[PDB]
Design a protein around this ligand. Sequence first.
Ligand SMILES: Cc1cn([C@H]2C[C@H](O)[C@@H](COP(=O)(O)OP(=O)(O)O)O2)c(=O)[nH]c1=O
Ligand SMILES: Cc1cn([C@H]2C[C@H](O)[C@@H](COP(=O)(O)OP(=O)(O)O)O2)c(=O)[nH]c1=O
Ligand SMILES: Cc1cn([C@H]2C[C@H](O)[C@@H](COP(=O)(O)OP(=O)(O)O)O2)c(=O)[nH]c1=O
Ligand SMILES: Cc1cn([C@H]2C[C@H](O)[C@@H](COP(=O)(O)OP(=O)(O)O)O2)c(=O)[nH]c1=O
Ligand SMILES: Cc1cn([C@H]2C[C@H](O)[C@@H](COP(=O)(O)OP(=O)(O)O)O2)c(=O)[nH]c1=O
Ligand SMILES: Cc1cn([C@H]2C[C@H](O)[C@@H](COP(=O)(O)OP(=O)(O)O)O2)c(=O)[nH]c1=O
Ligand SMILES: [Mg+2]
Ligand SMILES: [Mg+2]
Ligand SMILES: [Mg+2]
Ligand SMILES: [Mg+2]
Ligand SMILES: [Mg+2]
Ligand SMILES: [Mg+2]
Lengths: 132, 130, 132, 132, 132, 130
Amino acid sequence: GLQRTLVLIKPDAFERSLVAEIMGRIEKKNFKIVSMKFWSKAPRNLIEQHYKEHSEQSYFNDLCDFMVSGPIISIVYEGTDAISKIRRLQGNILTPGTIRGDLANDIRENLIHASDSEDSAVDEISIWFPET
Amino acid sequence: LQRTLVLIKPDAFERSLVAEIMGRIEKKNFKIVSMKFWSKAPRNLIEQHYKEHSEQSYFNDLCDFMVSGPIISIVYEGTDAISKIRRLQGNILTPGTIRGDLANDIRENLIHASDSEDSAVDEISIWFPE
Amino acid sequence: GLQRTLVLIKPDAFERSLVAEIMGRIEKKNFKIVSMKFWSKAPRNLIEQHYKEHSEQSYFNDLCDFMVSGPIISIVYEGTDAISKIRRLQGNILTPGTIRGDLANDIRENLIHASDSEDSAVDEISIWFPET
Amino acid sequence: GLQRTLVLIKPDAFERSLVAEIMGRIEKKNFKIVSMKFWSKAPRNLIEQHYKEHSEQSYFNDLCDFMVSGPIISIVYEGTDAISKIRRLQGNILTPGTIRGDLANDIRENLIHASDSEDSAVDEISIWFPET
Amino acid sequence: GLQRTLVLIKPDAFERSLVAEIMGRIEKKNFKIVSMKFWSKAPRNLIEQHYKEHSEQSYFNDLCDFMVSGPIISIVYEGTDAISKIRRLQGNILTPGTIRGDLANDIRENLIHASDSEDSAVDEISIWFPET
Amino acid sequence: LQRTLVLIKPDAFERSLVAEIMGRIEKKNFKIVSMKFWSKAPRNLIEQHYKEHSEQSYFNDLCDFMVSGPIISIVYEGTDAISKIRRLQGNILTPGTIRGDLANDIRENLIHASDSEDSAVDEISIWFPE
Ligand SMILES: Cc1cn([C@H]2C[C@H](O)[C@@H](COP(=O)(O)OP(=O)(O)O)O2)c(=O)[nH]c1=O
Ligand SMILES: Cc1cn([C@H]2C[C@H](O)[C@@H](COP(=O)(O)OP(=O)(O)O)O2)c(=O)[nH]c1=O
Ligand SMILES: Cc1cn([C@H]2C[C@H](O)[C@@H](COP(=O)(O)OP(=O)(O)O)O2)c(=O)[nH]c1=O
Ligand SMILES: Cc1cn([C@H]2C[C@H](O)[C@@H](COP(=O)(O)OP(=O)(O)O)O2)c(=O)[nH]c1=O
Ligand SMILES: Cc1cn([C@H]2C[C@H](O)[C@@H](COP(=O)(O)OP(=O)(O)O)O2)c(=O)[nH]c1=O
Ligand SMILES: Cc1cn([C@H]2C[C@H](O)[C@@H](COP(=O)(O)OP(=O)(O)O)O2)c(=O)[nH]c1=O
Ligand SMILES: [Mg+2]
Ligand SMILES: [Mg+2]
Ligand SMILES: [Mg+2]
Ligand SMILES: [Mg+2]
Ligand SMILES: [Mg+2]
Ligand SMILES: [Mg+2]
């Protein structure tokens, strides 16, 4: 079950210098970087597309604002059961042992995005890496 | 925004794990608001801090240990600080938490964190009357 | 109180240089080394005994071939509730916070073995450390 | 044998969340905390006394303003050869392996202060811990 | 003295999963990523240009071969005294405290490249990031 | 390619620093070739290992400590292993090395590494006659 999955490293990661920490945890679980982009400021269209599912929620504009308030890294990762596993890795701000669990404490500012399903992954990879 | 009371226990000093513990709370973006180093804490304060436990078998050993070496009392502050730092503290069974990664005993478990809004307000008062 | 349990650092830990990482996690939880042996190559029958409850499975041969594909270390750890506590520490590749949860991503190449009960502990210790 | 020395964790360590990192390095070299105080804001005259040998320099005012720009922690560490050993640990922004060498990149915002002699140690301790 | 400098993360870093470790050390010394590229396999022309100074040494072909035997990351870093400081950080396989000092042990396979001068930096940044 | 002899000393076990030490040697890409755990080492072996020091004031305290707790003897292998692992060991003055980061005493200093090709061949023989 070899998969690719899309990871965004969010502006708060850069603010708090947790970028390598975050990538290191994914690296140590043996997943490989397939492609990678650094955006000093992400084009607002990309961000809007990326969180399209949310275009209606009341947190949509604040979220876009924040996602654009600093650098982000978009990463395509590959490995056995990648989508599911990098999601567990991402975790949530409640449970320790995870990226969010250990280093994040905000509903908006939570360091990392990881695709949550087979479809969202294909989608998200084409948004950030259109060249396939 | 919330505040909570953390105690670094004597085993933490014994085992040179003080920075490791504080570091974990630091990495989850919680901020120190007050801090005191007690080379040895007054048994009075301990018994207050653990007053709800005054009727248990373990009560006297607890206090004995709690005055067996230094402790640091810290007031932390951040969003949802009380329950998040509590989840961080964890227990000796759950790896990923402080106790889960570093502690192996029912008594010597490195850290105390307030477990409710009331406990916090009261414990803070105990350790930081001012 | 005190128990002793048997741990194996598997060949993948050597290949991936996670020997110290694994051992460090058991060390930071306050467990002590009572015995320890480094095997550049473990004799096959030791492996086969160690996994004897597993001899009828389909995976049995490949497992043994893997366990013989590089160095292993056998360690007897001692501590309160050591068997159960070191088992949780090992965890599984689905559980962030544990050894396999953070560092392994494979059904067979999962870094570490830990005894799962009092009897298997006593049995496994006598296999790697028969001189007692 | 035993010496005590005075350490300050400067405001930049709080802003950058390196308080535990700094203290950990001193802890891993086996030095012990004898006294310790957290100041959300250090009174200015304490800072000025602490840096009194520095009062005629051009940088004197900005230094003091910085030291007052956030929390600091004053710590008395005790250990063999503590004054000299903790000084080397602090190092400088040019020397990899030390605190400033790995984590600081600035003439003024350099994370940590350590006493540089027996006399300054005795003097600085009496400033932050006059109750003795 | 604000500077940009060019860093390459070499294939051995990917082999040994030290990528985030290496980047983390630069991050913790407070340098910022200005731009960044991931190359699954670097175009051999780029590598030849990058090590042009060496086109004559007997190690030139082996070096190119190795630089192309796996992924690399090219990074432009910014910060006070960046060229000089990231060079100290890089270090050499003899002295601990550095990236190479702590993690490398080969004259060829040494994890990281960092520009060593103001000119080599301008040059190397234009090779990998021609868009300026 | 070279081989060298490393001893993890009892203070390393006392202070729970065994993985930290081995980990540093592991990260510089050196490989374990033989390893033995001694719960307590025969004073005989120690005195051999430290035979060149048999005439110093510190000699008996040295041996006393060296048999005061467990030790691990390791044979490492890698390019230029003897001098590189020696540089890694360092001394209590030089931060960045093992002793420089973790040790603060002239006797209890966590680790021994062979310091020459001859010392290595001889020390290896001592700890791994086989
Ligand atoms: C629910 C929620 C999400 N967000 C942001 C942060 C989330 O990472 C992002 C997507 O929301 P969500 O899908 O809930 O989180 P996840 O990334 O774990 O799937 O939207 C807010 O800013 N406010 C909110 O109330
Ligand atoms: C249950 C129990 C607690 N204790 C001590 C350790 C605990 O930190 C303290 C309070 O107990 P408890 O509230 O059970 O644990 P926690 O600290 O997680 O709230 O009392 C013992 O010494 N022995 C025991 O059997
Ligand atoms: C279940 C399973 C295990 N194994 C190997 C890896 C396991 O570590 C070992 C023992 O299996 P198991 O008891 O399932 O895991 P563990 O005891 O380690 O928690 O057998 C396979 O190779 N294939 C398999 O399908
Ligand atoms: C030399 C210098 C120091 N400082 C500040 C930072 C130093 O930590 C502090 C004391 O100066 P100094 O004694 O040079 O450094 P330290 O004692 O910390 O090794 O004064 C400046 O702000 N500007 C300067 O030019
Ligand atoms: C000297 C030397 C360098 N190299 C490779 C590795 C070096 O990183 C690269 C450039 O050489 P050099 O300029 O000596 O190293 P640095 O990157 O520290 O400036 O060439 C060899 O493969 N063999 C050699 O003998
Ligand atoms: C010089 C000295 C060494 N020793 C011990 C610690 C050393 O590890 C051991 C050998 O000494 P030495 O060769 O000086 O140090 P190293 O271990 O770096 O080669 O003897 C003392 O106990 N006291 C002393 O004064
Ligand atoms: Mg979602
Ligand atoms: Mg309770
Ligand atoms: Mg089992
Ligand atoms: Mg000075
Ligand atoms: Mg050069
Ligand atoms: Mg010597």
